[PDB]
Write an enzyme that holds these catalytic residues in place. Structure first.
Site, mmCIF file in Angstrom:
data_model
loop_
_atom_site.group_PDB
_atom_site.id
_atom_site.type_symbol
_atom_site.label_atom_id
_atom_site.label_comp_id
_atom_site.label_asym_id
_atom_site.label_seq_id
_atom_site.Cartn_x
_atom_site.Cartn_y
_atom_site.Cartn_z
ATOM 1 C CE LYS E 14 67.582 57.989 14.530
ATOM 2 N NZ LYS E 14 68.052 56.596 14.308
ATOM 3 C CG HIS E 133 73.415 53.741 6.568
ATOM 4 N ND1 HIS E 133 73.319 52.595 7.332
ATOM 5 C CD2 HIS E 133 73.112 54.769 7.393
ATOM 6 C CE1 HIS E 133 72.983 52.917 8.566
ATOM 7 N NE2 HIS E 133 72.852 54.231 8.630
#
Ligand SMILES: O=C(COP(=O)(O)O)[C@@H](O)[C@H](O)COP(=O)(O)O
Ligand SMILES: O=C(COP(=O)(O)O)[C@@H](O)[C@H](O)COP(=O)(O)O
Ligand SMILES: O=C(COP(=O)(O)O)[C@@H](O)[C@H](O)COP(=O)(O)O
EC number: 4.1.1.39
Lengths: 109, 467, 467, 467, 157, 153
Positions: E14, E133
């Site tokens: 992140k 994903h």
């Protein structure tokens, strides 16, 4: 009266100058602060030009308006890792590039 | 609607001069400096330029009415006379986004500068600037890497990078070439480089140079502990031969290659820039022949257009001139196009020669390379002018050192680092430059020998390319 | 032998000015027109040019002594002042054959015109001519086909060939483009052509144009009983994309394609010329951007150099100017470089701008293409100036005919054949041209309509490019 | 102009004998030694040769008049009788540059020596020399590397290089082959080599040899600290199979391969020489079958032509003969063609058999290889004749040493270095050679054993190939 | 991977977007050296102005080697090869293989099942592990009255 | 500048709800129709959507400060309630041009609709429209031919 140039390992920026006094180190850290760069101390067991990553000492000093605070971390890092190269780097987060980089400690002997 | 074919010659200004036009953000804007032939009015001259560079020809054609000419035609939307110059004007012309092939500098140049420069009705013409709209900028790859990624790849931070062109330009064998390369790099320079006219020749074929140079890089890098590189020139007669050369550089693990974008061309250069992006090789762009085009201020294309075109086509470095060296470079306009080749947003500023505000929509910057007739005494000025994000190159200023290449390289690297330290400490490179150099020469004998050698050497002539 | 390294700046004229030099037949010779900065002597200026364009840099380098500099250095072997021009000189410089990569125009240009044009010590510089030695000429392919083979391929003998550029330059869809092409070709023109800035654009993508144009060629050829062609523009952003386009033209059986050699570049052009030779496609070369470089006589490169460079790189046609049309062309020097691009041996003749005798060692000629602002009234002059071995192109002079394309094409083809017949019969095209045209207009209503339309249209301005 | 077809047989000397002709610098010149049949005049014989080797046939054809025969025909421009030989002449014939395909030795040979040797009207014919014009020389690649680049690649300076052909010629398995290679190389030889008829055979398939030999090179190199190599023979039935073999040599990192250029052919050899240049592999050229062609002085082609043809087609080494060894080599003419294969400019000198001055326009030299029936006693003569830039090869003179390969290799390497030191010190190898060898044998027991073994072995016969 | 006896541990870097390639690898090295088995691209990290994919692959490969040499455990980073076209997806997958990366990543719903099936085949032939994903799945599977339940999408994958 | 790492969970609306934002012409705009879970405020719901579809995650990460988050983050710049629908809103969110791979619909979808639809704090979510900026539209090929060329063919 030409000399043959000695072979000597170097360490990028400032490493062709006579070693920085602690006043000269602090002058460079002042420059960072003024430029708005965030100081980061990194250390590595080796100085290989090929490797991208050294190990981070704690986190970058994001909230820093004090050269001595940086110098304290370098002192503390050198205590724990005197067997290592230690390097001070400045980071510009706007251009997202490391703007400053010099070795402040080479390993013992 | 399109109604009524009337054959015959009309005035260009009837269709193409549109002083009420307000450029859309998707328009490509060009600024031309022109002198009309006697008896040719400025606005008809501007409209002739807009016409022949977009949709128009010399008589009326019926085929116009098959299409919507209002939406395709170039619009000379502004003319102003040059202050103090007699019979000289700027025309500002808007071109619809639709006129251009996506991602093609070749096509943009063919339209804007294809024919209009040879118009009989025009005495002289010079393209000063082009506002590349963001919608068009985004159809280009741009620099394979650009400034930030390059510094990260090379572990080079906190200073200008230092290079050296090997001399003589021509004549050395591949082995002696690598010899000169090893001695330069071991002395403290980041890069060495082929001269622009080293390609492949009887006295030195390219594969031999690549091979011996690769060895010199490994040796000097193992010795110094710093990443080293050499811009291998892959400029070639054909695309195929260019790719072949680029490919062997990759095979050898060479971090950087070199290309002459003007003498080879934008089509070959764009091919190479794409290749480089896919193969992680850095691309140094030499600007040979540029002065044939950009020197005189009455006719040609200003370099800042060529620099914008190259940022689009793709290069990681581009020679930007020295200002202070043996080749011409006006300081004001040089600071202008260095900003244009480096920054993301550059406001219009006519004092810097920047006619239009340019946005780059996050397209990477290009490292400016100062090269040509510079030496240690120039170092404080070079650092002040260009800052950290630059490559400073000393050909004769390294190989012409009294003690040879390695001392020559140390002299420059010491001179550089001294200037950077002094700058960071708050010294004025302008005022204190020679003192910073003399101080450093106290402890650096090879620097002292260089300062001694080149103390008297300045290049101070009247600049033809006045703003 | 090479003895003694002495560091420091010397005069260029010490090493590089050699007024006793007699050029070998293998030397490449260049003629430069230059003005030195005040206080820079002509011979030092000439030697600076010879130095920085061959082997030298700004200080003395020790590496010179590793090689044999006498055999590699450029030699400014002659300087003469320009008659009547103050502070203007010709320098004649010899370059060893060894300096150049075989078969590379890119490399020749990078050396001769790479840097010397931006020398601070030089106010202005212009390359006038290059004597390409036969030993070098033979390392190039040259025209894919050339004049004789082209006429044989197309069954076109005994007259100039006739073309037409489709207008508007931009804006037409692929279908309307082919429509305009069919009507032009059915009317009696040999060729139609893309405008130079038609590549691939939102309003007309290239594959669509190639497809509809191929259909128009088949139809108009089946109707007229004569071979028809259309120069499809394959000029592109990258080599890959250029080859792709050239390949589909071959797939469609198109006899001729088109390339902008300056805006795309010599490296891409040389690739294309080779391809064309191997695939039997004719190569029309457009010269877009040339006037940015070749217009002004004080600075740049004269077109006759660019024309010689293209004959070497490769093209079957090259735009040569009209002399009489809307774009500048000096008649004397135009006759000069038309000879240079057509003949095998051209004697030096300074009244034609031909500085050096040029031999082509049986390398095929390039068809000159007269295009730009010409119409039927120009026809006798165009035929007299260029002769049979030329292509005369009427863009607005076809599509701007009152009755449209096919009548427009007939008007030009009739005007042409009338002039050729009159010439063969011994009529003077100079004296009797308008009469030959009026006679033909008696029996050709479409010719009469064109003569009527363009009676008053002349282009008569002062030529900047004076010899 | 060409006027008037008259059918029927004329004399060749009418069109083709042109004693007033002065050869252009672009002409290819040939010198033939011929004997006419009784009643066939010398000049008609010379013209028949010029005719059938250029443009002519046996009757008059009308098609001649479609072209310009004066500019294409071969011209027997000189005839002289051989001094002291009855009915023997030299004809000197000039051929236009246009007659030859660029870069094709195959085509040059097909023209000059294609048919004329079997003319009934001619008893015997021998090609002595060809003057390759510089314009043609420049269409060839030449040696992949050549002498200078090879020495740089291998770190071999200051002496002749030393090789050894493995024996027996045929019969050894791949493993025993590499065994013999390791022992030779560890002993001090620079190279070992396949015999010319080792290709791929039941007793030893090529990939096996390449593999075991590569291992022997690595081992012997790691032991001695000097670069080692082995000329792997890639001579093959087909191009494909030749490339395959060359490719595996590259895969193994082998610095040098081997090719029989005459038995494989010039078309395959030229393919291989190009490959080698692109892949940085050195090319040793064996000359098998040459004596079928070049031995007798009345009929055939002198080796010095074949040597020039190979320098053009491409090779880094070429077997040149020994003079003193088991195979024939005339010293005077050997010094002649060694100069022709090494130097850039060789003046005409009929005492060395050099009929024409030859220029090579900076095309790299070819290392001469002395091989065949030589041993240690020959060493001073070999060094004196060939100098440093040569490879001296001892097959039986290494593997026939009493103590085996490694002692055999040391004997030769010591003998060589002794001779080179003595030479550099100013000793006369001619006068003092045996003494220099006996001195060295005092401290080198393996040299002493070789001197002992081959003391009595000389090859002294009448040379057929007299100048 | 020599991973037995426990769940494996990963970490998504992140911020989702914004980091340069070098800072990305920095964050990757520090995570992996600390004892995580994997790090990963966020699903919308593909190739963007601020960070082009080949640069990320290169700096991340370095961070994996360093952190692995330090800890003595196999490390990996799911490099996202999700791309505009099949060609571009293969190109990215290919460079991951070239670098000796043990695992790559794909968004099977936003890229599609045709591209995913291509990639899964490639991975089998090239011995690269494939992290999937599930971006966009909740557009389809959230509400119980209309759509497709995830357990169908999971079986399809 | 980026100053001060404070670990821990903050409200999304602190960073990502920006009702003063005026979209640039290069911004990609999305319109979402959503219903927040009971006790989840509309603006925090809109900011959660903007956060998890651009740059943000659920706690504060120090790595944010290595970059310039203001120039990368999605900005829920407007919320309006659906007329007549109870607990239904439109959120309008701006996304910087930089967030998207050129010419990739796959990447645009992965960002805008990748995860935000399954947020526990959100009962239902529907993407209504996307304003594709012209600068992005130009990185796509589009129809191989399109209407005019097809009719001509
Ligand atoms: O010969 C050169 C430099 O040599 P030296 O370092 O010996 O002066 C050229 O590469 C110039 O730099 C080119 O011009 P621009 O950089 O102005 O394009
Ligand atoms: O627009 C053109 C001609 O159109 P038209 O026939 O309507 O005048 C150009 O192709 C010029 O010919 C180019 O210049 P040069 O031929 O001088 O290079
Ligand atoms: O067998 C050979 C040598 O063996 P050894 O060394 O045992 O005598 C051949 O390679 C000859 O050298 C060839 O003839 P040229 O070299 O005259 O072409």
């Amino acid at each position: 009266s030409m000399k043959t140039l000695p072979k000597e390992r170097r360490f990028e920026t400032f490493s062709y100058l006579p070693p920085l006094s602690d006043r000269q180190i602090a002058a460079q850290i002042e420059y960072m602060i003024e430029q708005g760069f965030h100081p980061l101390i990194e250390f590595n067991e080796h100085s290989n030009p090929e490797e991208f990553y050294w190990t981070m000492w704690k986190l970058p000093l994001f909230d820093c308006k004090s050269p001595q605070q940086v110098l304290d971390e370098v002192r503390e890092c050198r205590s724990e890792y005197g067997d290592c190269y230690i390097r001070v780097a400045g980071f510009d987060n706007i251009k997202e590039c490391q703007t400053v980089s010099f070795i402040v400690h080479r390993p013992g002997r | 609607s399109a109604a009524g074919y009337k054959a015959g010659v009309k005035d260009y200004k009837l269709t193409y001069y549109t002083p009420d036009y307000t450029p859309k953000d998707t328009d490509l804007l060009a600024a031309f400096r022109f002198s009309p032939q006697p008896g040719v009015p400025a606005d008809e001259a501007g409209a002739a330029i807009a016409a022949e560079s977009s949709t128009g020809t010399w008589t009326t054609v019926w085929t116009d009415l098959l299409t919507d000419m209002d939406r395709y035609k170039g619009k000379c939307y502004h003319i102003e006379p040059v202050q103090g110059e007699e019979n000289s004007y700027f025309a500002f012309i808007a071109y619809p986004l639709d006129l251009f092939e996506e991602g093609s500098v070749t096509n943009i140049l063919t339209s804007i500068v294809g024919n209009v420069f040879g118009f009989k009705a025009i005495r002289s013409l010079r393209l000063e600037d082009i506002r590349f709209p963001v919608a068009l900028v985004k159809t280009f790859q741009g620099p394979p890497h650009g400034i930030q990624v390059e510094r990260d790849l090379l572990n080079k931070y906190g200073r200008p990078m230092l290079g050296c062109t090997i001399k003589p330009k021509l004549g050395l064998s591949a082995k002696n070439y690598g010899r000169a390369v090893y001695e330069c790099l071991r002395g403290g320079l980041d890069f060495t480089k082929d001269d622009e006219n080293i390609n492949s020749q009887p006295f030195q074929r390219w594969r031999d140079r690549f091979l011996f140079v690769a060895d010199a890089i490994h040796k000097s890098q193992a010795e110094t502990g710093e990443i080293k590189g050499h811009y291998l020139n892959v400029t070639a007669p054909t695309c195929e031969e260019m790719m072949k050369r680029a490919e062997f550089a990759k095979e050898l693990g060479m971090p950087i290659i070199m290309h002459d974008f003007l003498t080879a061309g934008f089509t070959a250069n764009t091919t190479l820039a794409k290749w480089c992006r896919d193969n992680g090789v850095l691309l140094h762009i030499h600007r040979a022949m540029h002065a044939v085009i950009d020197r005189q201020r009455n006719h040609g294309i200003h370099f800042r257009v060529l620099a914008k075109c190259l940022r689009l086509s793709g290069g990681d470095h581009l020679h930007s001139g020295t200002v202070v060296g043996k080749l011409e470079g006006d300081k004001a306009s040089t600071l202008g196009f260095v900003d244009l080749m480096r920054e993301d947003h550059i406001e219009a500023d006519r004092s810097r020669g920047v006619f239009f505000t340019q946005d780059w929509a996050s397209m990477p910057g290009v490292l400016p390379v100062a090269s040509g007739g510079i030496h240690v005494w120039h170092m404080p000025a070079l650092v002040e002018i260009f800052g950290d994000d630059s490559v400073l190159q000393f050909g004769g200023g390294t190989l012409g050192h009294p003690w040879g290449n390695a001392p020559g390289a140390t002299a420059n690297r010491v001179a550089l680092e001294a200037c950077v330290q002094a700058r960071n400490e708050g010294r004025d490179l302008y005022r204190e430059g020679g003192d910073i150099l003399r101080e450093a020469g106290k402890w650096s004998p090879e620097l002292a020998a260089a300062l001694d050698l080149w103390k008297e050497i300045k290049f101070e002539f009247e600049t033809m390319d006045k703003l």
